[PDB]
Write a protein that binds this ligand. Structure first.
Ligand code: BEF
Ligand SMILES: [Mg+2]
Length: 149
C-alpha cells in the first residue's frame, strides 16, 4: 500500500528533494527515479540526524537571506527504519524546528513493508504526510494527492 497520513520526465521540474536512507543502494535508486522525473536538485543523506541538520541549516539560511522559497526541500523522502534516529524521530524533530518559521515541508515515509499498528501510530504522531512503498511506484500519485490537499 501507499497513501496519505491523516512519461513524467518533467513531472518534478522546478523541485528540490531530499532523500534520506541508511542503505546506500536504496538511496541511489530513489535519487535515480527522481532525476528521471526532472527533479531540479536532489540531495541525499544517510541518517535522520543528517537530515535534521540539512533541514535546520537550510531553513535558517533561507530565513536569513529573505529567500523567495523558505523551504530548503519541496519534498523529503524519509526512510522509516534507520539506526540511532529513525525516520519517525527525525520527522518529529523536523516539525519542531519548522514551528519557528511557520512552514511545513511535505515528508513522505518510505518503507520496505506496510506499517503495523505501532508504526502506523508513529507515522501520524511524527507528522508525516504520506507513506510510500519503497518500489516508489506510487510516487507521482502520492505527490499529486499531497498537492491537492
Ligand atoms: F529502512 Be526503511 F524503513 F525502508
Ligand atoms: Mg533503512
Amino acid at each position: 500500500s501507499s497513501g496519505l497520513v491523516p512519461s513524467d520526465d518533467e513531472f518534478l521540474r522546478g523541485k528540490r528533494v531530499l532523500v534520506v536512507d541508511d542503505n546506500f543502494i536504496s538511496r541511489k535508486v530513489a535519487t535515480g527515479k527522481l532525476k528521471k522525473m526532472g527533479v531540479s536538485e536532489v540531495e541525499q543523506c544517510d541518517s535522520g540526524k543528517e537530515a535534521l541538520r540539512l533541514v535546520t541549516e537550510g531553513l535558517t539560511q533561507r530565513e536569513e537571506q529573505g529567500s523567495v522559497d523558505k523551504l530548503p526541500f519541496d519534498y523529503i523522502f524519509m526512510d522509516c527504519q534507520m539506526p540511532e534516529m529513525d525516520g519517525y524521530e527525525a520527522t518529529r524533530e523536523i516539525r519542531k524546528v519548522e514551528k519557528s518559521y511557520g512552514v511545513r515541508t511535505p515528508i513522505i515515509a518510505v518503507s520496505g513493508h506496510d506499517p503495523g499498528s505501532e508504526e502506523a501510530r508513529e507515522t501520524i504522531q511524527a507528522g508525516m504526510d504520506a507513506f510510500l512503498d519503497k518500489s516508489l511506484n506510487q510516487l507521482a500519485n502520492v505527490i499529486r494527492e499531497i498537492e491537492s490537499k
